[PDB]
From TrEMBL, chain A:
DNA-binding region(s), residue ranges: 27-46
Pfam families from the UniProt entry: TetR_N (PF00440)
DNA-binding recorded as keyword: yes
InterPro entries membership: Homeodomain-like_sf (IPR009057), HTH-type_TetR-like_transc_reg (IPR050109), HTH_TetR (IPR001647), Tet_transcr_reg_TetR-rel_C_sf (IPR036271)
The protein's name: EilR repressor
Keywords assigned by UniProt, alphabetized: DNA-binding
Residue ranges constituting the HTH tetR-type domain according to the UniProt record: 4-64
The encoding gene: eilR
GO molecular function list: DNA-binding transcription factor activity; transcription cis-regulatory region binding
SUPFAM superfamilies for the chain: Homeodomain-like, Tetracyclin repressor-like, C-terminal domain
Automatic annotation (TrEMBL), chain B:
Record keywords: DNA-binding
Pfam families: TetR_N
A GO molecular-function descriptor: DNA-binding transcription factor activity
Residue range(s) of DNA binding per entry: 26-45
DNA-binding listed as a keyword: yes
Domain HTH tetR-type: 3-63
Origin superkingdom: Bacteria
Protein name: EilR repressor
PROSITE patterns linked: HTH_TETR_2
Alphabetical list of InterPro entries matching this protein: Homeodomain-like_sf, HTH-type_TetR-like_transc_reg, HTH_TetR, Tet_transcr_reg_TetR-rel_C_sf
Length: 189, 188
């Protein structure tokens, strides 16, 4: 195992620890355990535990973007709705982490940078889908795919920030309804 | 006396909230900003958290009172002003509100208050939407409540991205997006 592959195995272990315990639980001891190596090796391959935490978080969100993706043959409406509000049960720990990364972004510079980067990734996926569906003729763009993507992502972020508070008139069903509706308005004139 | 000193103490809490945020809302500083002894605030407010939360609610209520327009301007302008004004003087209010949304994750009292301010915001948006629909200016393809939730959600999200320093999401871009979604929601 060359150095890149040790760095990599440790990174993946850190991804599991992130999805199982969150940011608080990503101690070098738990990461070293999950990777099956001695802590000293984790310190030798990742000199900043903070940097390791952030990069692992980024990789987790990337994996979330790959897990939510549908087959190319699927309708473009369905694809976009998956990339924004997928109800797939496998995504729970990822979302739970992303949410956390938001909060800790207020008090941790590195986590804030990583969170911004993940927002850019989310946007990239949404734009990709909007462009493909536009070229296919299913979506109707009266604005650029970038702006539309930022507005949809904003809708999801706000509706989630309200969903977590426990308001009854905004529940899972309401969430999906709203997201589908804004998609209809933005791309099906 | 009874409610007037309570009101002066509340005004103190509000000023300290707009000036420093929740962290600086200590009874020792609030009492000084009110010109009273530190114990009287304990006479008037059982829990310090109760004071922080109630004063926050009052701050947001005042924000909404400042953002309400002359009732004769176009309904679109009233709604927008109720949603997304770019006035710098509001940033101390906005700041506080942001702070609240964060502390709601770790403080049930501030959580209750924050929920309450969100419902107030909602009630205002619904008011303007219904009034504009009656006036024939707004065209509703959905209930004013759902439209309100989607618009407020747009504002909250775009704010969350705006605070990160995203260059493509700045003041101007924010305005553009909000205007656009209003156009889609009420002018089909
Ligand atoms: C960090 N951040 C602001 C957020 C991050 C993610 C989410 C998500 C989500 C979508 C619908 C939900 N529903 C159905 C309640 C719950 C979460 C989500 C976003 C994209 C793809 C799949 C799920 C929301 C907010
Ligand atoms: C805590 N929370 C979810 C939020 C609290 C306040 C805001 C606001 C706002 C609107 C536009 C902005 N721009 C132009 C950057 C900045 C703040 C805002 C809300 C209502 C009236 C005026 C401004 C947004 C989110």
């Amino acid at each position: 195992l060359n150095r890149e592959e040790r760095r990599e195995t440790i990174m993946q272990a850190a991804m599991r620890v992130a999805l199982d315990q969150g940011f608080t639980g990503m101690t070098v001891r738990n990461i070293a355990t999950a990777a099956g190596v001695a802590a000293g090796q984790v310190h030798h391959h990742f000199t900043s535990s903070g940097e390791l935490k952030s990069q692992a978080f980024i990789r987790v969100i990337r994996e979330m973007m790959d897990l939510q993706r549908l087959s190319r043959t699927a309708g473009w409406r369905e694809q976009l709705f998956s990339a924004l509000g997928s109800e797939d049960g496998r995504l729970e720990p990822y979302i739970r982490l992303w949410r956390q990364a938001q909060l800790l972004a207020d008090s941790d510079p590195e986590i804030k940078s990583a969170y911004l980067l993940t927002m850019n990734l989310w946007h990239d996926e949404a734009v990709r889908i909007i462009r493909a569906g536009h070229a296919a003729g299913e979506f109707t763009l009266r604005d650029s795919a970038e702006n539309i993507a930022w507005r949809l992502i904003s809708l999801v972020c706000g509706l989630d920030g309200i969903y977590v508070l426990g308001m009854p008139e905004v529940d899972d069903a309401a969430f999906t309804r709203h997201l589908q509706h804004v998609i209809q308005l933005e791309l099906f004139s």
